[PDB]
RNA sequence: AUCGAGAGGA
């Protein structure tokens, strides 16, 4: 492998290194081995980087993968975006897929979450728990024909004096 | 060197509308498909009795024209007598912008 | 007319591909794009 | 059905008149003449002849949208020479070449056989 | 879904789109019969009364006119019939549903609409011929051509709806898109190829044209610029007259490959304001690149100004190319005889080098390769050799040009086509890729009936030997045909797949927006990240910048930032400062110069750990580099006159600005730390750039000066904040969900290597977002 | 005489070949063009169908008729219908034609523009003679008729100009060249191999001096001496086209020079 | 109550893009209904364009309520906001 | 449509007079674009046109057939005995000026197909027309005086922008809009608005 | 004003590097040893054969518009054959007193190097280049 | 479909000519090109008026009505 | 030039579009996936023509 | 005027 790293003389210098590559995973086992670096070992499975090193690492190995799909395709997307995706997937404690399994069962609205998948059976157990609705998310006010609290509707106008 | 059979002639792997494309062996192979998408949508002389039938929708070309360049195979599909196009003189040149 | 008369429909492991044995039976380039692509065939 | 009637290429519409001269907002001693219902046939001519006039600083023409015959030409001349005059003297000469090329053609014709 | 999140709507239209190289960026050509049937509920004001009363008489047929007249008493006065249509007494306080009119705000849309870009405000120019026409460089972000593409347009119905249309969705503003921190509209087609032509050193044009050309730019100040040549025949250089479109105070410097301020290659780029100095203009500059003209004009001058610029280039180049022609002819693929034998004898040497490999494994002398099949290596082994062949024998056609070769000129402009498009035809086609492997034994042990079984050479398994020019041999055709199908097949599948991933991604951040504390929240109001994108900066106000503090030697570093007043060798020679010889020696202010340097070495140690790799370029707000060139002009500076500042000016001043660069306002304590932390990186640059031995040695500022740069950096920073309200959820998804759709190969071209099948394409993105338990290609990569 | 010069080479009833000396490019082209568009002519405009039991549908028949040529000799003495004072059309502005073929034979019963009839009063002038160049006498095959097929329509032909439709164009194709060696370097000759061998020379090389490689490129050189050939569809004998051509080009420079005095 | 006092406002004094797009829009809705104008009209007669001149000379009587997430809010007048943008 | 999947719509009509021309006086029907070419890699399009001119000159039948002994070479040779730069091109003059064309331009006869579609039979507008009975939303079908959908997609783009009153307007003041009555206790629509 | 430079140069390299109307030239002065000059000439207008002495000057005059010459009674510093207008950019210093100015005439570039360009070539967005014989 | 009058691309009345082209090789046993060259068509835009042109009017007339 | 091959159902031209199916009475062998009990399976669609 | 299927456009 290529790896750029500082020579004593201050500057970066091209330096080679032997890197071992694998088919399969079992991290907590290889890393305890003699003669390897247990600080820079990496497996493409972000679901085991999570299991072994902890949610915070999880965040950025997921990122690394989301990334080594766009840049590897030769396209560029500014961090902030993939960060925010990676983040939303992470805050709820563990990993939370972007499917009707993960994020959508989450305790958001009711309307706002039925505008996605499994539309009725969400509205049902929304009347079994008698779950309340905020009406502060987007779709809520889309359905009700209100001016949703977004950019324009983020704030309230009025009505002052002033007039003297 | 152990043959048993021989092919009637290799332009016969083509279907009824590809056998209109002039020079299929000089196209990238997708675009050979597109001409068979269209060309079906391309109007000419659907039949000869067209002025005697009562059909919702009917398109007839004022002046149709046997192409200036055929497929040997065209001739059994009767294109040359019921053609679907015209012989335009085309100027592959960048111009006014449009 | 002269195509829509010689057409070939398939219901529903690699079905849309232009499988080798097609030679001289199904046209290799006459097919509808998107939707039901490769599934519909011409002779 | 959104098609501009043909005869709107040579007949002058209503209101619309054949010439419209306006001071050039930007350059000292300059003018922008708008030609309604007239184009390349006559725009190019007046420009490339008008460049021959030595007391002319600047001259150019452009059809602005191909959808309309209406073309513009803007003319800058030297202190003490009116833009409008410069056009008149240019137009006049073109008259003279073509009233000539007429009779010079006239006699070459007659003299030919078959 | 069908009826509440997505309603059928009123006051709209849809037709076919056309190019109009004579329309200006933010406009839309809306045909009469349409803006003859759309109306805007306009009230009766003493302001518009006169230009309204005449719309009534006129009615629904003549263009500028009206349909309905709306009174107070609910009642509608229908003036396409009516006894009273040919008069009316209009009071103030009624409504006159006038026809749509020239220069109005409308929303232009093109589906699939997957982009804060597929949706834009335009101005209306009513026109004959029943198409929407739109100008040529709004073509990239709507993603259309005109091949029968058609498009959508709704018309606002309320006075603010139309304000909120032009003050937010107006194309001009939307020039630089928050997806990629770079502009999404540029110069293309004719205009692009053309500008490369018009801008060659060879390219001169004389009086006759150089008059019309100048007249072709609408905001031209009526001054014929002095020509390059004045000797026999006064020629004007291409470059020269194009520099007439380029506005003032526009500075650009690039460098391509071997470029030397003298441009032997005539490559690179340098604009020293208004006029260009050298280089050749194409896609890398005049195109929607990262740091080219369009990106620079927009931040520097403004949207409205840049959106004018767009038009001005085209009017000219288009006009020039109008009267210069250019074309492409089959002969543009007729590559040279003495090379033809060369190309074909290069495949011939690749063909016989698969032999010896085949002859080897058939003799059982091939091993292993490690971590693969006996067979499986050979399969790899052959695709390499046969792509190696195609690509070498390709670049034998790329050299065999031919500058007056129409094709290369396009690829050489970057207007259309790529190297592969030139290797294909003229030279050879290559290996035919299916299911990642080369053509499969469809028939038992042979791919077609015209082969013998057990045949493992190139064309038995789908190498198309010839080009497109020579023509494809029957055998090959069907092969190309196959791989062909697969291409189409997994379009009507990659599209389908993407457009689910987009939607899922969308309905899943839907509502995460930036709030009025710069933290980022959802419906519940959970924090997701405490300062939008870890710094509080709207992506649109961002540029990659070199850091420099990272790279170079420590030796190189101590000859760039070390001002040792005490050391008679490392002071600022009186040459540089008005003080100088009075500052040498001294201790009172050396302790400040000292603790400047120490802060700068700690920068250097800090960055070295954040950016482990060395890579020194990173997207950061406020382009500093460009604020210097502005100061190096706005204040007309002579690199021979020796400043007027104190050291104290520089070192103290820069720290004060440092504290003035607000992002989070709170008066507490923890916040005042996140202030520091989200400002931290930017500052290391700022510290690196506005450092003493730089501000005097390299870019040679005055006081007067400087204070200007100081206030500017502040004023530009604050403008680069995220505007609380900014709906960031939709923006994230959209921005990762669109590349998705414009990806290729859910295989790859890692498939020469039949094991570096690391699962990407969409499939990867599907596995990640599904949070898959059973992933396809899992891997340790131990160090 | 004076300015711009002509030197005829060939002068048929249908073709004028000539050179044109000492003129601007700007003026040559603008004469080539005004030729195409802008020259008064006469063609069928208002076709009023009474019976048509043909294989051909109504407005087809009635589009050929337009294209069909009509003698436009004295066209300069016939008002535009847009200009006239009469309701729809009179003998001063429009000439009225009648076709009328019944079928009759067991054989196909062709219909030619020879078959048309003039009905309008001519006052006495050269207008409305369907132009017949065909040897046997029957120019332009309008339409076929089998047995009982009938066709009877009335025509009105109005004055017009090819800027409106191309039925009014008296031009056909216009051949036009200048400087056959490229000593103006207006172009730049493509080649994979060689300029001189790959492109053939014009039939016009005969008239002009070759270059002589030993000389530097003529820079202060100018656009001059153009190689025009004009065809004629047949409404106007070639000469008048290229006369009225020069004439119209002049006549509408007039209306400008004039318009200047008015406003 | 609730309302956070003038002294101790901790948001952006700089007017957001959205804020102004609505300010201009709401004043345009008034102006359109010929309700009283607060500046010398320099030939200008387009509702929207007038509002720009009024926001230019800071003579618009509308205070902005900004809602922080907990429920409280902050008040800025279009009289005291920076309109730099 | 060409015969290869160059598509295109007429962006403009031009008269002969404004159009580029070959010294013989010819004038195209048909003026596509260079760029049409490297992208799509249709070469046949280029051949078919070459050997098609040759077929207008000769009076011979052109032969396009697939796997034959036709080449560009075999053809050219058969054109530059009829007398035109043996790879197509032709020297032309801009129509506006009369000047020569600084680059010469492959020009030659070919097929073009007139497909359905176009235009005054999809062009459509609406400002309140008829609505459905089941939703009080406007009807589908151009013909039937429909109204074009603001699909959930669209909505997405509207939000990105933050232009929210317009998103409400698209969704109330056109399309639906309705006024119901609620009882401030129970919270449904039992209320019987005995109005006026 | 008035003039700023005057010398005679010996052409040492004509270079048709992928062009047809322009050539990069290479020359050093007869008068003084330590100097060198690079220039993009319009070879089609003034042909240059290698080893072919030329005389090279720089002025700043002989500001409103450029008007068509109309030399019925006009006067320039036109005694010469070949003349261009341009802009100076980088003011480079090759170590010690050696120095080199770079000029652009509508993209045609000039790299002049010497030492006694001294009190002469200020960044004046002026500078006409002139050549004779 | 009844031979055109004028050719499209130039407008040389190629109208009266069709019948003749049918004689010069039916009777005057000629080959194509040479028959066009004699008819008057140097320019292939007209020359392609008549070499492509297909005449169906021949068949519609065959239907009895 | 009509070749036929269609039917007429109330003034309307109706064509029968050939239908594909897997052939019967051919015995085929199929490998069956990893997470299931059965390694190999052989199938035959017996039906009388 | 609604429900059902197909054909076609990006
Ligand atoms: O952004 C683009 C758009 C289009 N193209 C060129 O066109 C295609 C990309 O977009 P399309 O897929 O729409 O072009 P297409 O040729 O496949 O279909 P048509 O729109 O012509 O009906 C590709 O084939 C490419 O050659 C690009 O290369 N980049
Ligand atoms: Mg495209
Ligand atoms: Mg499209
Ligand atoms: Zn009359
Ligand atoms: Zn013709």
mmCIF file with all atom_site columns, N, CA and C in Angstrom, chain A residues 10 12 20 22 24 37 42-44 65 76 78-81 87 103 107 117 139 142 150 152, chain E residues 5 164 178 181 500 507 510 516 524 529 533-535 604 608 727 764 777-783:
data_model
loop_
_atom_site.group_PDB
_atom_site.id
_atom_site.type_symbol
_atom_site.label_atom_id
_atom_site.label_alt_id
_atom_site.label_comp_id
_atom_site.label_asym_id
_atom_site.label_entity_id
_atom_site.label_seq_id
_atom_site.pdbx_PDB_ins_code
_atom_site.Cartn_x
_atom_site.Cartn_y
_atom_site.Cartn_z
_atom_site.occupancy
_atom_site.B_iso_or_equiv
_atom_site.pdbx_formal_charge
_atom_site.auth_seq_id
_atom_site.auth_comp_id
_atom_site.auth_asym_id
_atom_site.auth_atom_id
_atom_site.pdbx_PDB_model_num
ATOM 1   N N  . UNK A 1 10  ? 10.232  17.069  8.361  1.00 0.00 ? 10  UNK A N  1
ATOM 2   C CA . UNK A 1 10  ? 9.037   17.910  8.359  1.00 0.00 ? 10  UNK A CA 1
ATOM 3   C C  . UNK A 1 10  ? 8.022   17.613  7.271  1.00 0.00 ? 10  UNK A C  1
ATOM 4   N N  . UNK A 1 12  ? 5.988   15.592  4.087  1.00 0.00 ? 12  UNK A N  1
ATOM 5   C CA . UNK A 1 12  ? 5.385   14.300  3.814  1.00 0.00 ? 12  UNK A CA 1
ATOM 6   C C  . UNK A 1 12  ? 6.225   13.571  2.785  1.00 0.00 ? 12  UNK A C  1
ATOM 7   N N  . UNK A 1 20  ? -2.758  -6.606  4.808  1.00 0.00 ? 20  UNK A N  1
ATOM 8   C CA . UNK A 1 20  ? -3.463  -7.867  4.598  1.00 0.00 ? 20  UNK A CA 1
ATOM 9   C C  . UNK A 1 20  ? -4.957  -7.650  4.396  1.00 0.00 ? 20  UNK A C  1
ATOM 10  N N  . UNK A 1 22  ? -8.954  -9.439  3.429  1.00 0.00 ? 22  UNK A N  1
ATOM 11  C CA . UNK A 1 22  ? -9.704  -10.634 3.827  1.00 0.00 ? 22  UNK A CA 1
ATOM 12  C C  . UNK A 1 22  ? -11.085 -10.793 3.152  1.00 0.00 ? 22  UNK A C  1
ATOM 13  N N  . UNK A 1 24  ? -14.461 -12.092 4.727  1.00 0.00 ? 24  UNK A N  1
ATOM 14  C CA . UNK A 1 24  ? -15.187 -12.511 5.920  1.00 0.00 ? 24  UNK A CA 1
ATOM 15  C C  . UNK A 1 24  ? -14.837 -11.639 7.104  1.00 0.00 ? 24  UNK A C  1
ATOM 16  N N  . UNK A 1 37  ? -1.468  -4.064  14.100 1.00 0.00 ? 37  UNK A N  1
ATOM 17  C CA . UNK A 1 37  ? -1.847  -2.773  14.669 1.00 0.00 ? 37  UNK A CA 1
ATOM 18  C C  . UNK A 1 37  ? -3.340  -2.747  15.008 1.00 0.00 ? 37  UNK A C  1
ATOM 19  N N  . UNK A 1 42  ? -9.393  -2.452  10.188 1.00 0.00 ? 42  UNK A N  1
ATOM 20  C CA . UNK A 1 42  ? -10.688 -1.995  9.678  1.00 0.00 ? 42  UNK A CA 1
ATOM 21  C C  . UNK A 1 42  ? -11.400 -3.051  8.862  1.00 0.00 ? 42  UNK A C  1
ATOM 22  N N  . UNK A 1 43  ? -12.680 -3.229  9.161  1.00 0.00 ? 43  UNK A N  1
ATOM 23  C CA . UNK A 1 43  ? -13.545 -4.135  8.415  1.00 0.00 ? 43  UNK A CA 1
ATOM 24  C C  . UNK A 1 43  ? -14.711 -3.357  7.818  1.00 0.00 ? 43  UNK A C  1
ATOM 25  N N  . UNK A 1 44  ? -15.027 -3.615  6.552  1.00 0.00 ? 44  UNK A N  1
ATOM 26  C CA . UNK A 1 44  ? -16.053 -2.837  5.864  1.00 0.00 ? 44  UNK A CA 1
ATOM 27  C C  . UNK A 1 44  ? -17.439 -2.945  6.494  1.00 0.00 ? 44  UNK A C  1
ATOM 28  N N  . UNK A 1 65  ? -18.359 4.240   4.608  1.00 0.00 ? 65  UNK A N  1
ATOM 29  C CA . UNK A 1 65  ? -18.987 3.425   3.580  1.00 0.00 ? 65  UNK A CA 1
ATOM 30  C C  . UNK A 1 65  ? -19.915 4.238   2.694  1.00 0.00 ? 65  UNK A C  1
ATOM 31  N N  . UNK A 1 76  ? -18.896 14.055  -5.983 1.00 0.00 ? 76  UNK A N  1
ATOM 32  C CA . UNK A 1 76  ? -18.588 14.727  -4.714 1.00 0.00 ? 76  UNK A CA 1
ATOM 33  C C  . UNK A 1 76  ? -19.838 15.312  -4.068 1.00 0.00 ? 76  UNK A C  1
ATOM 34  N N  . UNK A 1 78  ? -20.978 17.286  -0.266 1.00 0.00 ? 78  UNK A N  1
ATOM 35  C CA . UNK A 1 78  ? -20.379 17.909  0.911  1.00 0.00 ? 78  UNK A CA 1
ATOM 36  C C  . UNK A 1 78  ? -20.794 17.311  2.227  1.00 0.00 ? 78  UNK A C  1
ATOM 37  N N  . UNK A 1 79  ? -19.797 16.741  2.890  1.00 0.00 ? 79  UNK A N  1
ATOM 38  C CA . UNK A 1 79  ? -19.885 16.219  4.253  1.00 0.00 ? 79  UNK A CA 1
ATOM 39  C C  . UNK A 1 79  ? -21.215 16.488  4.957  1.00 0.00 ? 79  UNK A C  1
ATOM 40  N N  . UNK A 1 80  ? -21.439 17.744  5.357  1.00 0.00 ? 80  UNK A N  1
ATOM 41  C CA . UNK A 1 80  ? -22.656 18.165  6.080  1.00 0.00 ? 80  UNK A CA 1
ATOM 42  C C  . UNK A 1 80  ? -23.862 17.258  5.795  1.00 0.00 ? 80  UNK A C  1
ATOM 43  N N  . UNK A 1 81  ? -24.153 17.042  4.506  1.00 0.00 ? 81  UNK A N  1
ATOM 44  C CA . UNK A 1 81  ? -25.243 16.165  4.063  1.00 0.00 ? 81  UNK A CA 1
ATOM 45  C C  . UNK A 1 81  ? -25.129 14.708  4.534  1.00 0.00 ? 81  UNK A C  1
ATOM 46  N N  . UNK A 1 87  ? -25.769 10.917  10.919 1.00 0.00 ? 87  UNK A N  1
ATOM 47  C CA . UNK A 1 87  ? -26.162 11.303  12.271 1.00 0.00 ? 87  UNK A CA 1
ATOM 48  C C  . UNK A 1 87  ? -27.568 10.819  12.636 1.00 0.00 ? 87  UNK A C  1
ATOM 49  N N  . UNK A 1 103 ? -36.563 3.863   11.194 1.00 0.00 ? 103 UNK A N  1
ATOM 50  C CA . UNK A 1 103 ? -36.965 5.222   11.520 1.00 0.00 ? 103 UNK A CA 1
ATOM 51  C C  . UNK A 1 103 ? -38.482 5.404   11.626 1.00 0.00 ? 103 UNK A C  1
ATOM 52  N N  . UNK A 1 107 ? -41.170 7.094   17.486 1.00 0.00 ? 107 UNK A N  1
ATOM 53  C CA . UNK A 1 107 ? -42.271 7.840   18.118 1.00 0.00 ? 107 UNK A CA 1
ATOM 54  C C  . UNK A 1 107 ? -42.519 9.290   17.627 1.00 0.00 ? 107 UNK A C  1
ATOM 55  N N  . UNK A 1 117 ? -45.207 4.408   4.603  1.00 0.00 ? 117 UNK A N  1
ATOM 56  C CA . UNK A 1 117 ? -45.554 2.984   4.371  1.00 0.00 ? 117 UNK A CA 1
ATOM 57  C C  . UNK A 1 117 ? -46.646 2.459   5.326  1.00 0.00 ? 117 UNK A C  1
ATOM 58  N N  . UNK A 1 139 ? -45.248 17.101  6.861  1.00 0.00 ? 139 UNK A N  1
ATOM 59  C CA . UNK A 1 139 ? -46.436 16.458  6.286  1.00 0.00 ? 139 UNK A CA 1
ATOM 60  C C  . UNK A 1 139 ? -47.752 16.731  7.032  1.00 0.00 ? 139 UNK A C  1
ATOM 61  N N  . UNK A 1 142 ? -49.180 19.735  5.764  1.00 0.00 ? 142 UNK A N  1
ATOM 62  C CA . UNK A 1 142 ? -49.426 19.530  4.347  1.00 0.00 ? 142 UNK A CA 1
ATOM 63  C C  . UNK A 1 142 ? -50.815 18.931  4.204  1.00 0.00 ? 142 UNK A C  1
ATOM 64  N N  . UNK A 1 150 ? -41.858 26.088  8.031  1.00 0.00 ? 150 UNK A N  1
ATOM 65  C CA . UNK A 1 150 ? -40.662 25.846  7.237  1.00 0.00 ? 150 UNK A CA 1
ATOM 66  C C  . UNK A 1 150 ? -40.205 27.180  6.637  1.00 0.00 ? 150 UNK A C  1
ATOM 67  N N  . UNK A 1 152 ? -40.143 29.998  5.349  1.00 0.00 ? 152 UNK A N  1
ATOM 68  C CA . UNK A 1 152 ? -41.175 31.010  5.357  1.00 0.00 ? 152 UNK A CA 1
ATOM 69  C C  . UNK A 1 152 ? -41.994 30.965  6.639  1.00 0.00 ? 152 UNK A C  1
ATOM 70  N N  . UNK E 2 5   ? -50.660 14.306  0.110  1.00 0.00 ? 5   UNK E N  1
ATOM 71  C CA . UNK E 2 5   ? -49.276 14.739  -0.038 1.00 0.00 ? 5   UNK E CA 1
ATOM 72  C C  . UNK E 2 5   ? -48.979 15.159  -1.473 1.00 0.00 ? 5   UNK E C  1
ATOM 73  N N  . UNK E 2 164 ? -42.143 35.417  -2.718 1.00 0.00 ? 164 UNK E N  1
ATOM 74  C CA . UNK E 2 164 ? -41.534 34.178  -2.217 1.00 0.00 ? 164 UNK E CA 1
ATOM 75  C C  . UNK E 2 164 ? -41.118 33.276  -3.371 1.00 0.00 ? 164 UNK E C  1
ATOM 76  N N  . UNK E 2 178 ? -26.115 23.914  -3.074 1.00 0.00 ? 178 UNK E N  1
ATOM 77  C CA . UNK E 2 178 ? -25.615 23.426  -1.788 1.00 0.00 ? 178 UNK E CA 1
ATOM 78  C C  . UNK E 2 178 ? -25.295 21.937  -1.777 1.00 0.00 ? 178 UNK E C  1
ATOM 79  N N  . UNK E 2 181 ? -21.111 22.324  -3.140 1.00 0.00 ? 181 UNK E N  1
ATOM 80  C CA . UNK E 2 181 ? -20.467 23.635  -2.925 1.00 0.00 ? 181 UNK E CA 1
ATOM 81  C C  . UNK E 2 181 ? -19.869 24.302  -4.173 1.00 0.00 ? 181 UNK E C  1
ATOM 82  N N  . UNK E 2 500 ? -36.487 4.690   -5.264 1.00 0.00 ? 500 UNK E N  1
ATOM 83  C CA . UNK E 2 500 ? -37.014 4.254   -3.995 1.00 0.00 ? 500 UNK E CA 1
ATOM 84  C C  . UNK E 2 500 ? -36.105 4.769   -2.886 1.00 0.00 ? 500 UNK E C  1
ATOM 85  N N  . UNK E 2 507 ? -38.380 10.773  2.982  1.00 0.00 ? 507 UNK E N  1
ATOM 86  C CA . UNK E 2 507 ? -39.389 10.664  4.040  1.00 0.00 ? 507 UNK E CA 1
ATOM 87  C C  . UNK E 2 507 ? -38.800 10.388  5.417  1.00 0.00 ? 507 UNK E C  1
ATOM 88  N N  . UNK E 2 510 ? -37.168 14.318  6.192  1.00 0.00 ? 510 UNK E N  1
ATOM 89  C CA . UNK E 2 510 ? -38.243 15.232  5.814  1.00 0.00 ? 510 UNK E CA 1
ATOM 90  C C  . UNK E 2 510 ? -38.170 16.558  6.543  1.00 0.00 ? 510 UNK E C  1
ATOM 91  N N  . UNK E 2 516 ? -33.481 28.311  15.380 1.00 0.00 ? 516 UNK E N  1
ATOM 92  C CA . UNK E 2 516 ? -33.010 29.626  15.768 1.00 0.00 ? 516 UNK E CA 1
ATOM 93  C C  . UNK E 2 516 ? -32.017 29.609  16.951 1.00 0.00 ? 516 UNK E C  1
ATOM 94  N N  . UNK E 2 524 ? -40.042 15.855  17.007 1.00 0.00 ? 524 UNK E N  1
ATOM 95  C CA . UNK E 2 524 ? -39.892 15.696  18.439 1.00 0.00 ? 524 UNK E CA 1
ATOM 96  C C  . UNK E 2 524 ? -39.104 16.852  19.068 1.00 0.00 ? 524 UNK E C  1
ATOM 97  N N  . UNK E 2 529 ? -27.607 17.084  15.466 1.00 0.00 ? 529 UNK E N  1
ATOM 98  C CA . UNK E 2 529 ? -26.263 17.635  15.580 1.00 0.00 ? 529 UNK E CA 1
ATOM 99  C C  . UNK E 2 529 ? -26.355 19.085  16.050 1.00 0.00 ? 529 UNK E C  1
ATOM 100 N N  . UNK E 2 533 ? -24.049 20.806  10.375 1.00 0.00 ? 533 UNK E N  1
ATOM 101 C CA . UNK E 2 533 ? -22.818 20.359  9.713  1.00 0.00 ? 533 UNK E CA 1
ATOM 102 C C  . UNK E 2 533 ? -21.563 20.816  10.457 1.00 0.00 ? 533 UNK E C  1
ATOM 103 N N  . UNK E 2 534 ? -21.558 20.549  11.760 1.00 0.00 ? 534 UNK E N  1
ATOM 104 C CA . UNK E 2 534 ? -20.433 20.831  12.661 1.00 0.00 ? 534 UNK E CA 1
ATOM 105 C C  . UNK E 2 534 ? -19.769 22.246  12.579 1.00 0.00 ? 534 UNK E C  1
ATOM 106 N N  . UNK E 2 535 ? -20.346 23.197  11.846 1.00 0.00 ? 535 UNK E N  1
ATOM 107 C CA . UNK E 2 535 ? -19.782 24.565  11.848 1.00 0.00 ? 535 UNK E CA 1
ATOM 108 C C  . UNK E 2 535 ? -20.773 25.734  11.739 1.00 0.00 ? 535 UNK E C  1
ATOM 109 N N  . UNK E 2 604 ? 0.040   23.648  13.476 1.00 0.00 ? 604 UNK E N  1
ATOM 110 C CA . UNK E 2 604 ? 0.687   22.702  12.575 1.00 0.00 ? 604 UNK E CA 1
ATOM 111 C C  . UNK E 2 604 ? 0.662   21.288  13.148 1.00 0.00 ? 604 UNK E C  1
ATOM 112 N N  . UNK E 2 608 ? -2.063  18.286  11.621 1.00 0.00 ? 608 UNK E N  1
ATOM 113 C CA . UNK E 2 608 ? -1.397  17.042  11.288 1.00 0.00 ? 608 UNK E CA 1
ATOM 114 C C  . UNK E 2 608 ? -2.116  15.835  11.870 1.00 0.00 ? 608 UNK E C  1
ATOM 115 N N  . UNK E 2 727 ? -34.404 24.423  5.720  1.00 0.00 ? 727 UNK E N  1
ATOM 116 C CA . UNK E 2 727 ? -34.923 23.079  5.838  1.00 0.00 ? 727 UNK E CA 1
ATOM 117 C C  . UNK E 2 727 ? -33.910 22.014  5.426  1.00 0.00 ? 727 UNK E C  1
ATOM 118 N N  . UNK E 2 764 ? -24.648 -1.522  -3.062 1.00 0.00 ? 764 UNK E N  1
ATOM 119 C CA . UNK E 2 764 ? -23.996 -1.139  -1.815 1.00 0.00 ? 764 UNK E CA 1
ATOM 120 C C  . UNK E 2 764 ? -24.906 -0.215  -1.027 1.00 0.00 ? 764 UNK E C  1
ATOM 121 N N  . UNK E 2 777 ? -20.011 -8.605  0.254  1.00 0.00 ? 777 UNK E N  1
ATOM 122 C CA . UNK E 2 777 ? -18.554 -8.730  0.215  1.00 0.00 ? 777 UNK E CA 1
ATOM 123 C C  . UNK E 2 777 ? -17.875 -8.152  1.461  1.00 0.00 ? 777 UNK E C  1
ATOM 124 N N  . UNK E 2 778 ? -17.874 -8.924  2.569  1.00 0.00 ? 778 UNK E N  1
ATOM 125 C CA . UNK E 2 778 ? -17.297 -8.475  3.836  1.00 0.00 ? 778 UNK E CA 1
ATOM 126 C C  . UNK E 2 778 ? -15.796 -8.754  3.911  1.00 0.00 ? 778 UNK E C  1
ATOM 127 N N  . UNK E 2 779 ? -15.062 -7.890  4.605  1.00 0.00 ? 779 UNK E N  1
ATOM 128 C CA . UNK E 2 779 ? -13.606 -7.874  4.500  1.00 0.00 ? 779 UNK E CA 1
ATOM 129 C C  . UNK E 2 779 ? -12.866 -7.244  5.688  1.00 0.00 ? 779 UNK E C  1
ATOM 130 N N  . UNK E 2 780 ? -11.941 -8.003  6.272  1.00 0.00 ? 780 UNK E N  1
ATOM 131 C CA . UNK E 2 780 ? -10.912 -7.414  7.122  1.00 0.00 ? 780 UNK E CA 1
ATOM 132 C C  . UNK E 2 780 ? -9.857  -6.823  6.206  1.00 0.00 ? 780 UNK E C  1
ATOM 133 N N  . UNK E 2 781 ? -9.271  -5.699  6.602  1.00 0.00 ? 781 UNK E N  1
ATOM 134 C CA . UNK E 2 781 ? -8.158  -5.128  5.854  1.00 0.00 ? 781 UNK E CA 1
ATOM 135 C C  . UNK E 2 781 ? -7.028  -4.764  6.806  1.00 0.00 ? 781 UNK E C  1
ATOM 136 N N  . UNK E 2 782 ? -6.537  -5.748  7.557  1.00 0.00 ? 782 UNK E N  1
ATOM 137 C CA . UNK E 2 782 ? -5.593  -5.510  8.671  1.00 0.00 ? 782 UNK E CA 1
ATOM 138 C C  . UNK E 2 782 ? -4.333  -4.696  8.321  1.00 0.00 ? 782 UNK E C  1
ATOM 139 N N  . UNK E 2 783 ? -3.863  -3.887  9.274  1.00 0.00 ? 783 UNK E N  1
ATOM 140 C CA . UNK E 2 783 ? -2.629  -3.125  9.100  1.00 0.00 ? 783 UNK E CA 1
ATOM 141 C C  . UNK E 2 783 ? -1.539  -3.681  10.005 1.00 0.00 ? 783 UNK E C  1
#
